[PDB]
RNA sequence: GAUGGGGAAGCUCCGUUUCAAAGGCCUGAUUUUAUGCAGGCCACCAUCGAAAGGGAAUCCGGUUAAGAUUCCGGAACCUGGAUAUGGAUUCUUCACGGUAACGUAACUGAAUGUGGAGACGUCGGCGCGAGCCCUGGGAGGAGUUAUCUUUUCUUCUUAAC
RNA sequence: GCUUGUGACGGCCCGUGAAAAUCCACAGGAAGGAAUAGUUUUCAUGCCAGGUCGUACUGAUAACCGCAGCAGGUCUCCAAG
RNA sequence: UCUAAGGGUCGGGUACGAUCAACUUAGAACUGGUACGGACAAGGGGAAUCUGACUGUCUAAUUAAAACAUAGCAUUGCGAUGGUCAGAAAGUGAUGUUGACGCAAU
C-alpha cells in the first residue's frame, strides 16, 4: 500500500528526503539514459533515411 | 534468506576458492566451488589470442583431440596466420634478395 | 654504547636488496670469438622495466654459434633503441646507437653506455638512467682508450674493453619532485630498507655520536677522518671542504 | 605484363597450402558468380620430396622422391607472384574448372599432376619448385 | 549421460556385448497446447554412459518394445 | 568552460606541497602523459608506460626513451654526434 | 641446508654450483643368456620450506543417537595399466573440405629447437551472467473474517556430467 | 535493485605489480610404413586398478590464549523485508 | 489530492499509429491546536597570537606534542685493486640482479 502511494508520487516531498539529490539518482545516470536515447534515435532515422548521414553526423556530435 | 557455507576446509577467499551459488533438485541453495578460468593461448609472434584453438586449463589439453589444439595451415595452433603471411613473404623476399646480393658482388670481383 | 645504524647495515639482515621482481642482471654478451674477431647480430625482442631500476632493460636474443639454440641476453636499453631493432656486437661492427663496440674501434668523442672496466667484464661504467661515457683519448702502443666517466673522472682502460653506442634510456627521471613521502616510500620499497632516516642528532648517545644534549647539536666537528674507526664514521667522512659550493663546478 | 598468366610460379600465402609453391595453370583474371574475385587455378606441391643423399640407396631414393600434390582455386590476393616460371602443358586439361567440383575428378587430376611433378623432379628440371620454402 | 534418436543406432546398443540391463520409462505428457500423449524413454546402461532414446509416439514404441533382445534384462516402468 | 586558471592537471594536489614543486611536476606530467608521434608508422599513438619505455598503440613498436618525454635533448644531440662520427669512417 | 672443498684448538663456521674426474635416458645390440656393449644425446649439479600461493579428476537425492562432496542410491570424471572390436587411413601411401579467417570423429612423427598455458597491480564508470530481492495469472495448503479485504501468509524445485 | 562473478575499456606510478612443478602446440623430418593387403589409438566403444595419513566437536560473554565457564584478546566466507 | 516534463517495443513504396513497463523532478489545490529530517539519524560558529608546512610516526601500561618522519634544500665519501659496513678466520659477507639520474654518510 505504501509503495502504491509512493508510485502515486506521495511521501516524496522535501521533508521525506534524507539523501542528496545526487545520491537518490546519479546525475550521470540521467545523462547516460538521455544521451543513449538521442544516440539511437539518430541511428534509426539514419537507418530509415528520414535523415541523411551528413545531417546525422552533425547531430551526433551536437547531441 | 538461505545463506551458504564453503564446501571445503579452506575458509578464505583465495583465487583457488571461488564460490558459485546453485539451486539443487532438493529445492535448496548450495555452494559449489569453481575452477579458475582458462585463458586463451596466445600467438608467439604478435601476441593475440589465437583463434581456432580451444581454451582450457593446461592439463585439460591432455584429454582433448588434436583438433582442439590446432588449426590446419603450417605453424598451426602456434602463430597467428597474418603473422604467418608475414613470415612467408619475408622468407621469399630475403631469400630472393640474397641472390641479388651474390650475383652483384660476383660482378664486383670482375669489375674493380 | 649501542652499535649504530650504519654499522648494522653491514650484516645484511633487514638491509639486503629486494631482488624478487628483478628482470635478471644486466650484462653484455660474453666476449666470445664472434664479438672480438667480427660482429654478431641480435634482435631486441622486448624493452622492459626493471624494478628498483631507473632505466629500461632490453631483452636481446642471439644465435648460439656452437649449438642450434637461442641465447637471450639482458641489456640496459640505450635511448632510442627499439623492439625489432637489429643489434650488432663486435670488433668489426658498425657505429650505430644500440651496437656494442670495443672502445678501441670508435673515434674520439663517441658516446657509449655500460662500458667494461676490464675487457669482458660484461659492462660496468655508466649504467644509470641517463649516464654515459665519452671517449677522449686513444693510445695505440699498449692499446688503451681514455674516457671521461659520468662523475667527471677521467680513466684509461684497454681498447678491447667493450661499450654500447649511445646513452642510457629514462634520462631526466630525477628532475621530478617526489612530492610526497609516499612516492619515496614506494621508491625504496623496490630497492632496499634505507628509508626513512632518523637523524643521529635526534637519537640518544647510545645510538650515535650525534646523540644527546639538551638542544639538538652535533657538538663536535662533523667532518670525520678517513682513519676513523667503525662507529665513528658518521657525518662528513674525509671531507676536504665543506659548505655551500659557491662558484662554478666542472672539472678543469 | 598482366603477369599472373600461363605458367607463373607463386607461393600460396594463406590457407592449408600456405607457403607451398604453385604453378598458375589458368587465370580467371576477373569474375565468377561462384568465385567473385580475381583468382587462379593452380597445381601445387603439398608434401615435397625430401632431400636425397649418396648414402640413400635403391628403394629409399625411390621413396624419398615421392611427391604429394594438390590443386586449388585461389584468390590472386593470396599468391606471391614469383620471378620463376614452370611449364604446365602436360596438365593443361587436367586442371580445369570442370576438374573442380566432383571429387572423383579432382582425385584423377592430381594423379596426372603427381606423375608430371615427379618426372620433372628427376632430370632436375625446375629445382627451385621442389625446394621447400623455409619460414 | 546420453540422448539418442537414430532408432537403428539404438538397436545396436541393445546388442552390445557389454550392455546387460535396460529400462523403459513411461510419462504422462501434454502435446502442442491442447491434449496430452504417452511418452516413452528407452534407457540402456553401458559401462561408461547411459543412453536414452525418447520415442514420443506410443505406436512406434509398442513394436520397439517387442524388438528388445530376449536376453536383455529390462526393468519395466 | 575553462575549469581552472592555471594549476591544470596539477589540480589533484590541491594546496599541498606548494606552488613551485607543483609547477615543476605539472610540466613533467604534461610531458609524460601526452600522446606522441610514432617514428615508424606515423600515427600520434605513442604513450609512456614506466619511465623510459615508449610504446606505439597500433603497430606495437616500443622505443626506449627519456623518463618523462620520448626523445631527450641529449640523446638526440648524441644521435647527431654519432651521425657525424660514423660518416667519418665511410668517408 | 647436506656434498668436493676452505676456515677453526675444537663444539663447529663459511660456501650451494661453489676452483669437483659430481649423473640417467632412450633404444639398439641378445636370440650362448640374460643384460655385457653398440649410437647419440642431456650437463640439469642435492634436499627442506605453502592444510590461504601453483595444482589431474564427483555430483545430486536419501541415510545416522553421533559420519558424510567419505556411507547407500544413481549418474560421472581423472590418472596409470592393459588392449581388442568398429570407424578412419593407404594402389596418389602418412585425410579431406573452405578464395580466406578456418572446418572436422579420426587423420604416423625420434633427436633437437621454439611457442603458449601455469602466471599474476590497483581504482573508476559502463555491459552481460548468476543467486537474492520485487511482482501478475493459476493450481494447492494454512490464517483473519462484528465489519472490511477476488485478501494475508505459504509450496510451485532441477546437480555434476 | 542487492551481493557476487565476468567482460571490453579507462586513471595511476622515479611503484609497472612471484616462482616452479606440470600440460599442450608448433618448427624439424630420424625413422617406420600397403594392394593381395599394411599403417594407424590424440575417433568411438570395451577390461582392470587407484596405497598411506587427516576427517568427531568447539572456534568463543563456557571447548583457544589471559592462574578461571575472566565485560579483555584471537584470521576468515555466506547475509532477507 | 491533482497537473506538467523525462522512456521501450514493432510493421511504413524503393506524417503518425499501436500498446508494454519504470520512481525521479518541478509546480498547483485542499488540510491540521503552525505541525512536518516529528523517533532514529545528524557540523557549533567567528576574529586573532604562538607553533609544526601538509598526510603520516612514537613512549603497550601516567607525556600524541611544538617531539620523529617527510617532500624540498645543502654538504661528504666513492670508478670496483673502490666507498660504507660485517666477521675469530677464510677460496667469508651486506650494499650488489648494483655503477655516480648510483650506493653510502651527515
Ligand atoms: Mg558529473
Ligand atoms: Mg535507447
Ligand atoms: Mg565524430
Ligand atoms: Mg567443511
Ligand atoms: Mg583481490
Ligand atoms: Mg581447430
Ligand atoms: Mg574448436
Ligand atoms: Mg608436416
Ligand atoms: Mg657495543
Ligand atoms: Mg639478496
Ligand atoms: Mg623502514
Ligand atoms: Mg630525517
Ligand atoms: Mg636525513
Ligand atoms: Mg633529507
Ligand atoms: Mg630524544
Ligand atoms: Mg657515543
Ligand atoms: Mg666523536
Ligand atoms: Mg649531541
Ligand atoms: Mg639543531
Ligand atoms: Mg652449511
Ligand atoms: Mg617440499
Ligand atoms: Mg598446497
Ligand atoms: Mg592451495
Ligand atoms: Mg546430503
Ligand atoms: Mg553410522
Ligand atoms: Mg555434524
Ligand atoms: Mg558412490
Ligand atoms: Mg554406475
Ligand atoms: Mg586411458
Ligand atoms: Mg575424413
Ligand atoms: Mg617451454
Ligand atoms: Mg608465460
Ligand atoms: Mg600468483
Ligand atoms: Mg520466497
Ligand atoms: Mg565438475
Ligand atoms: Mg565481500
Ligand atoms: Mg600493466
Ligand atoms: Mg596449448
Ligand atoms: Mg639416417
Ligand atoms: Mg582415446
Ligand atoms: Mg608406487
Ligand atoms: Mg565436520
Ligand atoms: Mg560454545
Ligand atoms: Mg583455557
Ligand atoms: Mg572472555
Ligand atoms: Mg508520461
Ligand atoms: Mg508512449
Ligand atoms: Mg604536524
Ligand atoms: Mg594529523
Ligand atoms: Mg603511554
Ligand atoms: Mg617504561
Ligand atoms: Mg595526535
Ligand atoms: Mg595518552
Ligand atoms: Mg625552505
Ligand atoms: Mg683461503
Ligand atoms: Zn606506430
Element (H, E) at E50: strand E50-55
Through-space separation of residue E20 CA and nucleotide G61 C1' in angstroms: 25
* Cβ pair F64:C109 closer than 8 A: no
Judge contact between E43 and E29, C-beta under 8 A.
no
- Strands D21-28 and C144-148 turn out to be unpaired
Beta bridge partners of C164: C100, C113
> Residue E51 CB: number of other CB atoms within 10 A?
20
Cell numbers placing C74: 639482458
DSSP string for chain C? ----HHHHGGG-STTS--GGG------PPP--HHHHHS-EEEEEEEEE--TT-SS-EEEEEEE-TTSSSEEEEEEEPBTT-BTT-EEEESTT----TT-EEEGGGS-TT-EEESB-SSTTS---BS-STT--EEEEEEETTTTEEEEE-SSS-EEEEETT-EEEES-BSSTTGGGS---SHHHHHHHHHTS-S--S---GGGS-TTT-TT--TTTT---S-----TT--TTT--SSTT-S--S---S-----
Cell numbers placing C112: 657509449
The residue that minimises its CA distance to C1' of I73 is C244
Which residues, at least 6 apart from C124, have a Cβ–Cβ distance to it below 8 Å? C114, C115, C116, C117
C207 interfaces chain F, CB cutoff of 8 Å? no
What is the longest distance spanned by two Cα atoms in chain A? 52
Instruction: Please state, in angstroms and rounded to a whole number, the distance separating the CA atoms of residues B84 and B76.
Output: 10
Residues 170-199 of C with CB under 7 A from strand I: 170-174, 177-184, 191-192, 194-199
Dihedral angle of Cα F61, F66, F72, F76, to the nearest 10 degrees: -50
Through-space separation of residue C87 CA and nucleotide G30 C1' in angstroms: 56
Q: Which residue of C has its CA nearest to F60?
A: C83
Left, alpha or beta for B67 (phi > 0: left; psi -120 to 50: alpha)? Answer: alpha
Dihedral angle of Cα C8, C9, C13, C16, to the nearest 10 degrees: 180
CA distance F2 to chain C (A): 26
Instruction: Please state, in angstroms and rounded to a whole number, the distance separating the CA atoms of residues C137 and B110.
Output: 41
Instruction: Please state, in angstroms and rounded to a whole number, the distance separating the CA atoms of residues D27 and D92.
Output: 12
Cell numbers placing D99: 576438374
Judge contact between D45 and D24, C-beta under 8 A.
no
Q: Residue C124: which of C28, C9, C239, C29 has the closest Cα? A: C28
Which of D16, D18, D83 has the CB atom closest to B88's CB atom?
D18
Judge contact between C91 and C31, C-beta under 8 A.
no
DSSP state of B42: B
Judge contact between E10 and E53, C-beta under 8 A.
yes
Apex C95 CA angle, C91 and C100, nearest 5: 50
DSSP string for C132-144? -EEEEEEETTTTE
Instruction: Please state, in angstroms and rounded to a whole number, the distance separating the CA atoms of residues A31 and A15.
Output: 26
Method of structure determination: X-ray
CA distance B23 to chain D (A): 47
20-79 of D, contacting B, C-beta below 8 A: none
Q: Residue C58: which of C40, C86, C77, C78 has the closest Cα? A: C77
Judge contact between C18 and C191, C-beta under 8 A.
yes
DSSP state of A8: T
What is the longest distance spanned by two Cα atoms in chain B? 95
Cell numbers placing B60: 585439460
> Residue E69 CB: number of other CB atoms within 10 A?
13
F21 interfaces chain C, CB cutoff of 8 Å? yes
CA distance F27 to chain C (A): 9
Cell numbers placing E31: 502435446
Helix A27-48 / helix A53-62 crossing angle, nearest 10 deg = 170
**Ligand 49 centroid to F16 CA: how many Å?**
14
Instruction: Please state, in angstroms and rounded to a whole number, the distance separating the CA atoms of residues C157 and C144.
Output: 5
Instruction: Please state, in angstroms and rounded to a whole number, the distance separating the CA atoms of residues D4 and D39.
Output: 9
Instruction: Please state, in angstroms and rounded to a whole number, the distance separating the CA atoms of residues F55 and F47.
Output: 6
Instruction: Please state, in angstroms and rounded to a whole number, the distance separating the CA atoms of residues F90 and A39.
Output: 63
Nucleotides of G under 7 A from a protein CB: 42-43, 51-62, 69, 74-79, 92-108, 112-120, 125-127, 130-133, 155-161
Q: Residue B37: which of B16, B9, B62, B64 has the closest Cα? A: B16
Query: Can you give the C-alpha Rg of chain A in angstroms?
Result: 19
Element (H, E) at D76: none
Judge contact between F79 and C109, C-beta under 8 A.
no
Element (H, E) at D96: none
Cell numbers placing C172: 631526466
Instruction: Please state, in angstroms and rounded to a whole number, the distance separating the CA atoms of residues F86 and C166.
Output: 13
Judge contact between B29 and B21, C-beta under 8 A.
yes
Q: Residue D24: which of D108, D105, D90, D81 has the closest Cα? A: D81
Instruction: Please state, in angstroms and rounded to a whole number, the distance separating the CA atoms of residues C179 and C160.
Output: 44
Which of C47, C166, C167 has the CB atom closest to F62's CB atom?
C47
**Ligand 29 centroid to B63 CA: how many Å?**
10
For chain C, which chains pass the contact test of at least 3 CB pairs under 8 Å? F
Which pairs count as long-range contacts for C118-121, CB under 8 Å and 24+ apart, including other chains? Answer: C118/C157, C118/C158, C118/C161, C119/C31, C119/C158, C119/C160, C119/C161, C119/C162, C120/C30, C120/C31, C120/C162, C121/C161
Beta bridge partners of D21: D11
DSSP state of D124: G
**Ligand 35 centroid to B2 CA: how many Å?**
23
Judge contact between C180 and C46, C-beta under 8 A.
no
Q: Which residue of C has its CA nearest to F29?
A: C176
Cell numbers placing B68: 582442439
Q: Is B50 exposed, middle or buried (0-12, 13-18, 19+ CB in 10 A)?
A: buried
Can you say how many angstroms the Cα of residue E35 is from the centroid of all Cα atoms in its chain? Answer: 23
- Edge to edge, what strands does the sheet with C144-148 contain? C70-76, C57-63, C40-48, C86-89, C100-102, C162-165, C111-113, C133-139, C144-148, C154-158
CA distance B102 to chain D (A): 17
DSSP state of F67: S
Instruction: Please state, in angstroms and rounded to a whole number, the distance separating the CA atoms of residues E61 and E37.
Output: 12
* Cβ pair B88:D15 closer than 8 A: no
Instruction: Please state, in angstroms and rounded to a whole number, the distance separating the CA atoms of residues C199 and C236.
Output: 14
Judge contact between C56 and C65, C-beta under 8 A.
no
Instruction: Please state, in angstroms and rounded to a whole number, the distance separating the CA atoms of residues C172 and C182.
Output: 20
* Cβ pair B73:D18 closer than 8 A: yes
Q: Which residue has the cell 609524460?
A: F32
> Which chain B residues touch D129 with a CB distance below 8 Å?
none
DSSP reduced 3-state for E28: strand
- Strands D68-75 and D39-47 turn out to be antiparallel
> Backbone phi, then psi, for B100, in 5-degree steps?
-60, -25
Element (H, E) at F22: helix F19-33
Which of D11, D14, D18 has the CB atom closest to B92's CB atom?
D11
Cβ pairs bridging B and D (under 8 Å): 38
Amino acid at each position: 500500500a505504501h509503495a502504491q502511494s509512493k508510485r502515486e508520487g506521495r511521501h516524496s516531498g522535501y521533508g521525506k528526503r534524507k539523501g542528496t539529490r545526487e545520491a537518490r539518482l546519479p546525475s550521470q545516470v540521467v545523462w547516460i539514459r538521455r544521451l543513449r536515447v538521442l544516440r539511437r534515435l539518430l541511428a534509426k532515422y539514419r537507418d530509415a533515411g528520414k535523415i541523411d548521414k551528413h545531417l546525422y553526423h552533425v547531430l551526433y556530435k551536437e547531441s | 534468506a538461505q545463506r551458504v557455507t564453503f564446501r571445503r576446509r579452506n575458509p578464505y577467499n583465495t583465487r583457488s576458492n571461488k564460490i558459485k551459488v546453485v539451486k539443487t533438485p532438493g529445492g535448496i541453495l548450495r555452494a559449489q566451488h569453481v575452477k579458475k578460468l582458462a585463458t586463451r593461448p596466445k600467438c608467439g609472434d604478435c601476441g593475440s589470442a589465437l583463434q581456432g584453438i580451444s581454451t582450457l586449463r593446461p592439463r585439460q589439453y591432455a584429454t582433448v583431440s588434436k583438433t582442439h589444439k590446432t588449426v590446419s595451415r603450417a605453424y598451426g595452433g602456434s602463430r597467428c596466420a597474418n603473422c604467418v603471411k608475414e613470415r612467408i613473404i619475408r622468407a621469399f623476399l630475403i631469400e630472393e634478395q640474397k641472390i641479388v646480393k651474390k650475383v652483384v658482388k660476383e660482378q664486383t670481383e670482375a669489375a674493380k | 654504547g649501542r652499535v649504530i645504524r650504519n654499522q648494522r647495515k653491514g650484516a645484511g639482515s633487514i638491509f639486503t636488496s629486494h631482488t624478487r621482481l628483478r628482470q635478471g642482471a644486466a650484462k653484455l654478451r660474453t666476449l666470445d670469438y664472434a664479438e672480438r674477431h667480427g660482429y654478431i647480430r641480435g634482435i631486441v625482442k622486448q624493452i622492459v622495466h626493471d624494478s628498483g631500476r631507473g632505466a629500461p632493460l632490453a631483452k636481446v636474443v642471439f644465435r648460439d654459434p656452437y649449438k642450434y639454440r637461442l641465447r637471450e641476453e639482458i641489456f640496459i636499453a640505450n635511448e632510442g633503441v627499439h623492439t625489432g631493432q637489429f643489434i650488432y656486437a663486435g670488433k668489426k661492427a658498425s657505429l650505430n646507437v644500440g651496437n656494442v663496440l670495443p672502445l678501441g674501434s670508435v673515434p674520439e668523442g663517441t658516446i657509449v653506455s655500460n662500458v667494461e672496466e676490464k675487457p669482458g667484464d660484461r659492462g660496468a661504467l655508466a649504467r644509470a638512467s641517463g649516464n654515459y661515457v665519452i671517449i677522449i683519448g686513444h693510445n695505440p702502443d699498449e692499446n688503451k682508450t681514455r674516457v671521461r666517466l659520468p662523475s667527471g673522472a677521467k680513466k684509461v682502460i684497454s681498447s678491447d674493453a667493450r661499450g654500447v653506442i649511445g646513452v642510457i634510456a629514462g634520462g631526466g627521471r630525477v628532475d621530478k619532485p617526489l612530492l610526497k613521502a609516499g612516492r619515496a616510500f614506494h621508491k625504496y620499497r623496490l630497492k632496499r630498507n634505507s628509508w626513512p632516516k632518523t637523524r643521529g642528532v635526534a637519537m640518544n648517545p647510545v645510538d650515535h655520536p650525534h646523540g644527546g644534549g639538551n638542544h639538538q647539536h652535533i657538538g663536535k666537528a662533523s667532518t670525520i677522518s678517513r682513519g676513523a674507526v667503525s662507529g665513528q664514521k658518521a657525518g662528513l667522512i674525509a671531507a676536504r671542504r665543506t659548505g655551500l659550493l659557491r662558484g662554478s663546478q666542472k672539472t678543469q | 605484363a598482366k603477369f599472373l598468366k600461363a605458367g607463373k610460379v607463386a607461393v600460396v600465402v594463406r590457407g592449408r597450402y600456405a607457403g607451398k609453391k604453385v604453378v598458375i595453370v589458368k587465370p580467371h583474371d576477373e569474375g565468377s558468380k561462384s568465385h567473385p574475385f580475381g583468382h587462379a587455378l593452380v597445381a601445387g606441391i603439398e608434401r615435397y620430396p625430401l632431400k636425397v643423399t649418396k648414402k640413400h640407396g635403391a628403394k629409399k631414393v625411390a621413396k624419398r622422391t615421392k611427391i604429394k600434390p594438390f590443386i586449388k582455386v585461389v584468390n590472386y590476393n593470396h599468391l606471391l607472384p614469383t620471378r620463376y616460371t614452370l611449364d604446365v602443358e602436360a596438365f593443361k586439361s587436367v586442371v580445369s574448372t570442370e576438374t573442380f567440383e566432383q571429387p572423383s575428378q579432382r582425385e584423377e587430376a592430381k594423379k596426372v599432376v603427381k606423375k608430371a611433378f615427379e618426372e620433372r623432379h628427376q632430370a632436375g628440371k625446375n629445382q627451385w619448385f621442389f625446394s621447400k620454402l623455409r619460414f | 549421460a546420453r540422448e539418442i534418436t537414430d532408432i537403428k543406432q539404438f538397436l545396436e546398443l541393445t546388442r552390445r556385448a557389454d550392455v546387460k540391463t535396460a529400462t523403459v520409462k513411461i510419462n504422462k505428457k501434454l502435446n502442442k497446447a491442447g491434449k496430452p500423449f504417452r511418452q516413452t524413454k528407452f534407457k540402456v546402461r553401458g559401462s561408461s554412459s547411459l543412453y536414452t532414446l525418447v520415442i514420443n509416439d506410443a505406436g512406434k514404441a509398442k513394436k520397439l518394445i517387442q524388438s528388445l533382445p530376449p536376453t536383455l534384462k529390462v526393468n519395466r516402468l | 568552460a575553462k575549469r581552472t586558471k592555471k594549476v591544470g592537471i596539477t589540480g589533484k594536489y590541491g594546496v599541498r606541497y606548494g606552488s613551485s614543486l607543483r609547477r615543476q611536476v605539472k610540466k613533467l606530467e604534461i610531458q609524460q602523459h601526452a600522446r606522441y608521434d610514432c617514428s615508424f608508422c606515423g600515427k600520434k599513438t605513442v604513450k609512456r608506460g614506466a619511465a623510459g619505455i615508449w610504446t606505439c598503440s597500433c603497430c606495437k613498436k616500443t622505443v626506449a626513451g627519456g623518463a618523462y618525454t620520448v626523445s631527450t635533448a641529449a640523446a638526440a644531440t648524441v644521435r647527431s654526434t654519432i651521425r657525424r662520427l660514423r660518416e667519418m669512417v665511410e668517408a
